[PDB]
Amino acid sequence: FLNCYVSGFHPSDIEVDLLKNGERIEKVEHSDLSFSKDWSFYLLYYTEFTPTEKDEYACRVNHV
Amino acid sequence: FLNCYVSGFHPSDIEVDLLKNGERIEKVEHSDLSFSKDWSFYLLYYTEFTPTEKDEYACRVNHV
Amino acid sequence: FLNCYVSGFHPSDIEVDLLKNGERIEKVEHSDLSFSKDWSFYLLYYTEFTPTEKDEYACRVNHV
Amino acid sequence: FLNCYVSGFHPSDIEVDLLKNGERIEKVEHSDLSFSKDWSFYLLYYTEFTPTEKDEYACRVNHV
Amino acid sequence: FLNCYVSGFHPSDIEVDLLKNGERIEKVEHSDLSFSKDWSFYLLYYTEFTPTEKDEYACRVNHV
Amino acid sequence: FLNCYVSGFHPSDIEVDLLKNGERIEKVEHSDLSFSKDWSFYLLYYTEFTPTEKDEYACRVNHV
Amino acid sequence: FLNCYVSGFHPSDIEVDLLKNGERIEKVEHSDLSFSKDWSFYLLYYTEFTPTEKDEYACRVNHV
Amino acid sequence: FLNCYVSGFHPSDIEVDLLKNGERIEKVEHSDLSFSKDWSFYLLYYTEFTPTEKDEYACRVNHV
């Protein structure tokens, strides 16, 4: 068995995922492929954060 | 068995997912493919956050 | 068994993922491929953070 | 068994991941591939941080 | 006389006027006067301008 | 007389005026006066300008 | 007389005026006056300018 | 007379004026006056300028 188990929990996060699984090119001829001519990425532009308040875990296990 | 199990819970998050599973090109001839001519991405533009309030977990397991 | 287990939990983070799984090129002829003509990345531009408040874990295991 | 186990938890971090798994080129002829014509990366531009508040762990194990 | 006279014309401006003519206190006893307990002033908060287009004057005077 | 006269014209400006004419205190007893307990002034907070386009004057005077 | 006269014109400026005419205190007893308990002044906070475009004057006077 | 006269014109400036005309204290008893308990001044905080474009004057006077 197993008691008081956590698998990874995100409080208060922001996650960004992009081309996660690994792009593959095979057997192409006389081609130009580009992923981007113009790409823009901006995660925080002129920004203020304000706090993320307290994130708590309490476990008790007795007498197993 | 298993008692007081968590699998990963997100409080107060924002998740962004883009091209997660891994794009594949096979057997192309005399082509231009582009993912983007003009792409714009902006996650937070001129922004203020205000707090995310407390996110709590309480478990008790007794006598298993 | 196993008691009071944590697998890695992120409080208060931001995660950025890009081309995670390892792009592969095989068997191409007479091609120009580029990942980027113009790429822009900016994680924090002109930004202020404000705190992330306390992130707590309390476990007790007795009498196993 | 195992008691009061942690696997690595990130409080208050930012993680950036880019080309993690190791790109591979095999069997190409008469090609120019470039990863970047113009790439921009900027992690913190003109920025102020404000603190990350206290991140605590308390475990007690008795009588196993 | 006078020909082709201008007195000062504002194109495209914003003017702010506050306590212009000079406040005066005379003959007071046992008083607290304050102009402000809490005052807020913010001229441009998180703002973008866009241009003010061309502002032209043409005068001709002949044979006076 | 006078020909093709300008008195000072502001294009594209912002003017701020505050306590212009010179405040005067006379004959006070047993007083606290303050102009400000808390004052806030912010002229441009987190701001972008965009251009002010061309501001032209053309005068011609002939044969006076 | 006088021809093609300018008195000072501001293009593209910002002017700030504060306590211009010279404050005067006369004949006070047993007083605390302060101009400021807390004063805040910030002219440009985290700001970008963009150009002010060309500001032109052309005069011609002939045969006076 | 006088021809093609300029009095001083400011293009593209910012002017700041503070206590210009010369403050005067006369005949006070048993007083604390302060101009500032806390004063803040910040002219440019974390700022980028971008150019001010060309500012031109052309005069011609003939045959006076």
Residue numbers in the entry:
A (entry chain G), B (entry chain H), C (entry chain F), D (entry chain E), E (entry chain D), F (entry chain C), ...: 22 to 85
Which statements did the authors publish about this structure?
The cryo-EM density revealed that the β2m fibril is comprised of two protofilaments arranged in parallel and is built from discrete layers of density. Each layer is related by a twist of −0.608° and rise of 4.83 Å, giving the fibril a left-handed twist, which was verified using scanning electron microscopy (SEM). The subunits in each protofilament have an identical conformation that is related by a 180° rotation along the fibril long axis (C2 symmetry). The β2m subunits have an ordered, L-shaped core formed by residues 22–85. By contrast, each β2m molecule in the fibril has six β-strands (strands 1–6) which are stacked parallel and in-register in the fibril core, consistent with previous MAS-NMR31 and EPR35 data. Remarkably, these β-strands correspond extremely well in position to β-strands B–F in the native protein, although the length of the fibrillar β-strands 1 and 2 are shorter than the corresponding β-strands B and C in the native β2m fold. The N-terminal 22 residues and C-terminal 14 residues are disordered in the cryo-EM structure, and β-strands A and G in the native structure which lie in these regions are not seen at high resolution in the cryo-EM structure. Residue Pro32, which is in a cis conformation in the native β2m fold, is in a trans conformation in the fibril, in accordance with the MAS-NMR data. Finally, each subunit is stabilised by an unusual face-to-face, three-ring π-stack (Tyr63, Tyr66, and Tyr67) perpendicular to the fibril axis which kinks the polypeptide backbone in the region where the protofilaments meet. The average centroid–centroid distance between rings of Tyr63/Tyr66 and Tyr66/Tyr67 is ~4.8 Å. This perpendicular π-stacking not only stabilises each subunit, but provides additional stabilising interactions between protofilaments, which associate via the heels of two subunits, forming an interface that is unlike that seen for any other amyloid fibril to date.
In its native, functional state, β2m forms a canonical, seven β-stranded immunoglobulin fold that chaperones the folding and assembly of class 1 major histocompatibility complex (MHC-1). Following dissociation from MHC-1, β2m is normally cleared by the kidneys, but in patients with impaired kidney function who are undergoing long-term haemodialysis, serum levels of β2m rise as much as 40-fold. This leads to aggregation of β2m and its deposition as amyloid fibrils in the joints. Here, we created fibrils from β2m at low pH in vitro and, by combining assignment and distance constraints obtained using MAS-NMR with cryo-EM analysis, we solved their structure to near-atomic resolution.
